């Protein structure tokens, strides 16, 4: 084991380093959450094209052709529904993560704001002990006080 004060400085340095790594990682989660959402919009747009095309497909009376379009777009709709559900759980998941990070950062400062205060008290008392033992009290008359040791000399 080492001196308790020395650990405190080292421990917080590790703590601060870890926190930013958490901050960086959470950003990557947001990228995918946004990326898929942008990806989701693309598919429905394609389905709209077929639906829009199917609008005038039978405008000439060609009902048979419109059958394929509406049947075709169903496959695309399946992906849209699957992705919509997938984002729903992700959306409420990250929001919970952000709360932990924000609370941790607020809790982080309350420790550092006190660490300097404790060290000052520790340095004050440790020095005080060092001074007092060198008090050299004249009353000892036993050589414990270096002054009385001189007097004996």
């Amino acid at each position: 084991q080492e001196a308790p004060e020395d650990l405190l400085e080292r421990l917080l340095g590790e703590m601060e380093l870890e926190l930013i790594e958490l901050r960086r990682a959470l950003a990557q989660t947001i990228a995918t959450f946004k990326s898929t959402e942008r990806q989701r919009d693309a598919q429905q747009l394609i389905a709209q094209r077929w639906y829009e095309k199917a609008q005038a497909a039978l405008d000439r009376g060609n009902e048979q052709l419109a059958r394929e379009a509406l049947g075709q777009r169903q496959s695309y709709q399946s992906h849209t529904e699957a992705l919509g559900k997938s984002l729903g759980e992700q959306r409420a998941l990250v929001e919970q993560v952000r709360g932990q990070l924000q609370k941790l950062e607020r809790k982080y400062l309350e420790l550092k704001s006190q660490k300097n205060l404790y060290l000052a008290r520790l340095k004050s008392a440790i020095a005080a002990q060092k001074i007092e033992e060198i008090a050299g009290n004249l009353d000892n008359a036993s050589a414990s006080s270096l002054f009385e040791r001189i007097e004996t000399k």
Binding site: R23, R24, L26, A27, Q28, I30, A31, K34, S35, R98
Partner: protein, 43 residues
């Protein structure tokens, strides 16, 4: 691109929508009150 933009917004919490509501909510009276006094001050 989105990776970087994500870091900035989090490190600098943008205004909450409620704060946005108040800001615009305040300006309407300021312009209307000035406009209300515009007609009155001129006439």
């Amino acid at each position: 691109i989105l990776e970087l933009e994500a870091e900035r917004e989090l490190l600098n919490p943008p205004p909450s929508p409620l704060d946005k509501k108040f800001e615009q909510w305040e300006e309407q009276q300021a312009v209307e009150a000035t406009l209300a006094a515009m007609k009155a001050r001129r006439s």
